[PDB]
């Protein structure tokens, strides 16, 4: 008569690493590293992303005519730029503090596009019909949907002064541009004053702009430039535009709401009818495990990104069926 | 192992014990079979459950973390920002891989300890009424029926009750 003390074995082929020994086959184990994704862009906590299509941030804000227009009001959980954004700034020049604007838009949850300065009504005695071939649409020369190229009318450019009081109860994002012609002949033919200036003020913003005429190497077949500027007009505050030339005026502006947990990602994937708590540029992860090796960029509630190929904890025993 | 039992003086495990991590196999006249020691198995599960949950709990949820952009005159800021992303990633890759190795070592040793503790718990119950025939088994110097085997398993073995018969067979 005999009794024996022993331990469990089974048919598991799980392996784990330890300090003293690699590749130990064990009976029961737990994986801590998520490495799978679904290849799709998904809703995040029920809210769809803002997909910019053929545009980048700059092209959507300025109103590039090549990009399909969006509904006047959008809400989103994160913004998706495509890697091959061909449509952005179409008239060459510099977007000032562009990178800080992106960072601001990373915490915006919603916009409402609205006509801040109605076209035929805000700049009397000035031409508003200017277009260019650098910003073409359906072959024809066109212009930014959100801005307006004000030019001379009947051989004069009178000094203008317009202003907007923000009663939207949310920050308003105002964008404008400043044109720089390549020679003083075109400066006269367009704004009739060689010593033009533009002035833009709010309670807290204060900047003045001067034409800088010089020949420049052609970009998109243009020897002049157009710089672009922006400010966030606080609720109740007033923005005043004053100029006697060279101003690319605001026509449409954005009332903005703030949010949490949003972001901008660049992604090759497509939107699908799916929902997730965690989004990467490659696809959505479910978020039960503590680590993930799929992407360092994440939106939402996500595991922590690590370079590991394997993170497996043993729970059972050294498996010896011999 | 550190405690000599698993893969030690108990060379292998039992595919036949399907209801627990630690247990017993017996052989008497009424028959033979396996039975697992639930009290030690449930202790081990409780400890490893806590170990696994603590490993997950120390890792906070990772909220949104996306890149920034920089212009051509902000390289130093872009390199600092890259240094911060790489540095935190270096550290968390290291922390995760090391914590799992270190806990895997201790988890195997914890099992090895539990087996041996059970073996010594049985050995001290039987004393000289049986003999260690190696490999983690005991041979009784007396007849041990199912009721006797059950008394060893649940820690109530009656040493005097069989001491005489054992002394005789031991001679």
């Amino acid at each position: 008569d005999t009794i024996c003390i022993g331990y469990h074995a089974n048919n598991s082929t799980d392996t784990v690493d330890t300090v003293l020994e690699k590749n130990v086959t064990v009976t029961h184990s737990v994986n801590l590293l998520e490495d799978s994704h679904n290849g799709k862009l998904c809703r995040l906590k029920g809210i769809a992303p803002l997909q910019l299509g053929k545009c980048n941030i700059a092209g959507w804000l300025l109103g590039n005519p090549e990009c399909d227009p969006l509904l006047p009001v959008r809400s989103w959980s994160y913004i998706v730029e495509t890697p091959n954004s061909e449509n952005g700034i179409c008239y060459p020049g510099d977007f000032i503090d562009y990178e800080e604007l992106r960072e601001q838009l990373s915490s915006v949850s919603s916009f409402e596009r609205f006509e801040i300065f109605p076209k035929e009504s805000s700049w009397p005695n000035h031409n508003t019909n200017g277009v260019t071939a650098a910003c073409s649409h359906e072959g024809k020369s066109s212009f930014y949907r959100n801005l307006l190229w004000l030019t001379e009318k009947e051989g004069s450019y009178p000094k203008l002064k317009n202003s907007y009081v923000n009663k939207k109860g949310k920050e308003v994002l105002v964008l404008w541009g400043i044109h720089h012609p390549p020679n003083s002949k075109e400066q006269q033919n367009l704004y009739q004053n060689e010593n033009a200036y533009v002035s833009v003020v709010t309670s807290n913003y204060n900047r003045r702009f001067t034409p800088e005429i010089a020949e420049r190497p052609k970009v998109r077949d243009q020897a002049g430039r157009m710089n672009y500027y922006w400010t966030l007009l606080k609720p109740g505050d007033t923005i005043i535009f004053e100029a006697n030339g060279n101003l690319i005026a605001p026509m449409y502006a954005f009332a903005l709401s703030r949010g949490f947990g949003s972001g901008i990602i660049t992604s090759n994937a497509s939107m699908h009818e799916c929902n997730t708590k965690c989004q990467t540029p490659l696809g959505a992860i479910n978020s039960s495990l503590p680590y993930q090796n799929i992407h360092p960029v994440t939106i939402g509630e996500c595991p922590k990104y690590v370079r590991s190929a394997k993170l497996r904890m043993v729970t059972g025993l050294r498996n010896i069926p011999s | 192992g550190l405690f000599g039992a698993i893969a030690g003086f108990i060379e292998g495990g039992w595919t036949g014990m399907i209801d627990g991590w630690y247990g017993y196999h017996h052989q008497n006249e009424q028959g033979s079979g396996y039975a697992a020691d639930q009290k030690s198995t449930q202790n081990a599960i409780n400890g490893i459950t806590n170990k696994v949950n603590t490993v997950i709990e120390k890792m906070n949820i990772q909220f949104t973390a996306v890149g920034k952009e920089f212009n051509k005159l902000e390289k130093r800021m872009e390199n600092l920002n890259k240094k911060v992303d790489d540095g935190f990633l270096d550290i968390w890759t290291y922390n995760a891989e090391l914590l799992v190795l270190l806990e895997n070592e201790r988890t195997l040793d914890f099992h090895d300890s539990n087996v041996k503790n059970l073996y010594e718990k049985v050995k001290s119950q039987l004393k000289n009424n049986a003999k260690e025939i190696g490999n983690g088994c005991f041979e009784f110097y007396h007849k041990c029926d199912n009721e006797c085997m059950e008394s060893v398993r649940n820690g109530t073995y009656d040493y005097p009750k069989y001491s005489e018969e054992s002394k005789l067979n031991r001679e």
Partner: peptide, 11 residues
Amino acid sequence: XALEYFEWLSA
């Protein structure tokens, strides 16, 4: 989390 490896384990 639970390690329910056998049904008699509890939750």
